[PDB]
């Protein structure tokens, strides 16, 4: 049973003073078996990369996530960063009506359509469930060489 | 009269999903005068650049800034970066070894950089206990100029 992690990733990179952070999303039966794709996602020096925290996601706005090797859909998972506070996950339509969506949740950004991770595609199903958006882990796991 | 300012900058970088943020040291008589050496600095995407904190730095353990233009000093400026300044730390040591050890005391494998030259100018340190807390001036949001 394959599973979608969202995964926060911290490391080195040529010309920076400190270390930086990313946001992957991965595909795996474990979060070991995501490593290679975590190391090969991660754009900075790969000597260091850590694991900071991670979220099995099953579940976003009532909608449960599906994942299978073939597949159209309606309504698509988006990620959206603010230039676990700074981002969420909202299912939408359009990306546009997904950056509207992540403005009213608080009280110029940038989307991510997740929809095809690791070779496995993304369909999402309403069945009513909630699922907080935080971490299921947190700390500071190196990836192995 | 230059001063040393250390800067948040933020922006984007090809690959990551997420802005990514870099500690820069740059030098300069204005804020707005260290700009080009911000812009090439940055590892990134020059496209979509911004200012997000900076401190002008001219106290740190006692020990007052210098900048010149020509330069042996036994302590020197080291930068910490631990594995609101809350993740990082500037102070004065003599090794980069023992930077670390006074960085790891002060909270109650990490990262340091000696910061002596900085935008072609030198940087010295004269004792004269002064103290500066390492807060920002000035926080927000700020694009820089292409």
Redesign the interface.
């Known amino acids: 049973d394959n599973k979608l992690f969202l995964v926060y990733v911290g490391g ?14 991965v595909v795996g039966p474990s979060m070991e078996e995501t490593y290679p794709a975590i190391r090969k ?3 900075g020096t790969q000597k260091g990369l ?1 694991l900071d925290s991670f979220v099995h996601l099953h579940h976003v706005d009532g909608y449960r996530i599906h994942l299978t090797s073939e597949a159209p859909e309606e309504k698509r998972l988006y ?1 959206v ?1 603010f ?1 676990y506070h700074d ?1 969420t996950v909202v299912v939408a339509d359009s990306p546009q009506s997904a950056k509207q969506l992540a403005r009213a949740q608080f009280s110029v950004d ?1 989307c ?1 359509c997740v929809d095809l991770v690791d070779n496995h595609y993304v369909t999402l199903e309403f069945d009513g469930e909630q699922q907080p958006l935080v971490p299921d882990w947190k700390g ?1 796991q190196p990836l192995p060489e």
């Not at 400190?18 to 992957?24: F, G, K, Q, V």
């Open positions: 080195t990179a040529p010309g920076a003073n400190i270390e930086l952070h990313d946001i992957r999303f996602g991660w754009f850590h990620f960063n230039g981002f940038d991510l500071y």
